[PDB]
Structures are given as C-alpha cells and as structure tokens.
Structure 1
C-alpha cells in the first residue's frame, strides 16, 4: 500500500526497494534526475 510520511521520528520505513529503521528528515543533497537514492562514504 501507501502511507503518510512521518518525519523526525524513529519509524520503520519501506520505500520502493529500501527497508530499515531510522529517522526521516528533509535534505539538500542535489540528486540528479536519474538518481533514486544516495549512499554514505561507507556502503
């Protein structure tokens, strides 16, 4: 299904292909229009 987006709260999220627990918050990382998600200096 599809739910609302809970921010600034530890939630168990499931985006299209990405799962895990964490805290969601907006950001200013300039994705290119063909970049679905990002990664850290680790993996």
Structure 2
C-alpha cells in the first residue's frame, strides 16, 4: 500500500545512474534506475516483470 509504518532510516534521492543499492520500502537489490512511462493506478505501487 502507501507505505505506512517506516523505519528510522533517512531518505536519499534517486539517481538515473546504473547500479544503485535501492531500498524502496524494504525492497533491496541493485540496478539501473531509469524513469519510464508506466500507468500505475493509485492502488498499485509495485510493478513486476
């Protein structure tokens, strides 16, 4: 959902640059983080392959 109960970690800002240890609400990993054009209804906040 819109992520409600968070942790004390400070929030940085995104970069389009490759290979960033992204942590969008407990979703760790890495990768190129380029913005794209996807629809994303407001009741869906996490798209999959």
Task: Tell me if both proteins adopt one fold, taking TM over 0.5 as the criterion.
Answer: yes
Q: Compute the displacement of 1:36 (Å).
A: 1.1
- Structure 1: which 5+ runs fail to align? none
Q: Compute the displacement of 1:18 (Å).
A: 1.0
Q: Compute the displacement of 1:37 (Å).
A: 0.7
Aligned positions of 1:5-20 closer than 5 A: 5-20=14-29
Structure having the higher strand fraction is: 1
Please give the TM-score of this superposition, normalised by the length of structure 1.
0.75
Between the two proteins, the alignment pairs up a number of residues equal to 40
Runs of 4 or more, structure 1, over 3 Å off, are: none
Q: Compute the displacement of 1:8 (Å).
A: 2.7
- Structure 2: which 5+ runs fail to align? 1-9
Q: Compute the displacement of 1:9 (Å).
A: 1.8
Let me know the Cα RMSD of the aligned residues: 1.4
Q: Compute the displacement of 1:38 (Å).
A: 0.4
